[PDB]
């Protein structure tokens, strides 16, 4: 990564071993799941691409997920070739060259190079863009390698609201709808899959009601 | 009737044989029910006092209630004798004769008179005179021919609030009473016939609730 020396200026020093390590052990354990994301997100912070290409193809296992992921960084990186056309005539001396999509994964671009443009007045974010593509990626990977569908979840006819509801927005955790359409979700469909006894009792409770007298509304059911 | 002309004057003409049967027809489908004032009251615009013998002598069937209504015309002609005496000397020359109540009732007036009446200047609305009595008439009818109290009203052990309360504004809708007691019935009787199960509901909306509100709040019960 690029980091700020004690002296006030920034300078590259390497990812260490048990930060390596974290990443390797995350996605051991936690696989696809969504807390994957902040994860990498504060271990990626102050990374190159070149760290970012390390880490990608340290990966064990997954291989058709780090395929969807490549095909994906390429697509996003044929974007920026489209939507930033390459400038007007001959590179000057006195400046360094404007990248590719590809210089942003990493690929065409050196380390030095990856310096200059980070540390350079004004900086351009490069990881920040590669950063995106691999969120992005990452909602792709996590929408497809969901099992279950929002309407399928519904309250067993023994089972607690209180595990229902845990089901719930650890499900809704995994959709990306804006607000609106989550709101609904929540007013509608939540009820509606509810068990007849705890159904008859959120009944009762009217409109307006918050989800600790829910919880506290069906414990007895 | 007596209907206005194109010319722009007030004309007698008959009443037409599919209003007629239109007035036979409500009759024998609705018999005493309410609905049977407004659509009487309707089809008697512009009506004669003659044209009201007719309707009412045209009726078959419910001979008591024929009965009553005829005793009650007569007791309202006889009120309408009580409370105007008749005129101070003779009749003037230039002026034609002020009416009885068997002359309201059609009974004592000839057409020709029943169209001076009205037709001259001012104009005396002997038509809307007998109405009332025949509305009035209307009303000990149908207090008379309801055969359930407001009291008897309830709601079932499994019988939906929703049927209930159509129940209940439909014996209300046979109640004469003033709005404000009307009103405290409202608020009063229609919780307290309501079964434990949705009475229980009704208690938790308290106060201040409205008819959407207790209906949807009653619905799964």
């Avoid at 990608?56 to 390429?74: D, P, S, W, Y």
């Avoid at 351009?124 to 995106?132: L, N």
């Avoid at 409770?205 to 989800?211: F, S, V, Y």
Wanted: glycine share 6%.
């Amino acid at each position: 990564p690029i980091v700020q020396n004690l002296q006030g200026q920034m300078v590259h020093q390497a990812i260490s071993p048990r930060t390596l390590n974290a990443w390797v052990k995350v996605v051991e354990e936690k696989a696809f799941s969504p807390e994957v994301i902040p994860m990498f997100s504060a271990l990626s912070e102050g990374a190159t691409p070149q760290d970012l290409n390390t880490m990608l193809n340290t990966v064990g296992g997954h291989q058709a997920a780090m395929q969807m992921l490549k095909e994906t960084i390429n697509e996003e990186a044929a974007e920026w070739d489209r939507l930033h056309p390459v400038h007007a005539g001959p590179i000057a001396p006195g400046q360094m060259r404007e990248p590719r999509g590809s210089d942003i994964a990493g690929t065409t671009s050196t380390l030095q190079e990856q310096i200059g443009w980070m540390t350079h007045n004004p900086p351009i974010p490069v990881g920040e863009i590669y950063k995106r593509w691999i969120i992005l990626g990452l909602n792709k990977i996590v929408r497809m390698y969901s099992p279950t569908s929002i309407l399928d979840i519904r309250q067993g006819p023994k089972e607690p609201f209180r595990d229902y509801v845990d089901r719930f927005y650890k499900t809704l955790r995994a959709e990306q709808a804006s607000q609106e359409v989550k709101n609904w979700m929540t007013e509608t469909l939540l009820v509606q899959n509810a068990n007849p006894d705890c159904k008859t009792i959120l009944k009762a409770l009217g409109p307006g009601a918050t989800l600790e007298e829910m919880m506290t509304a069906c414990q007895g059911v």
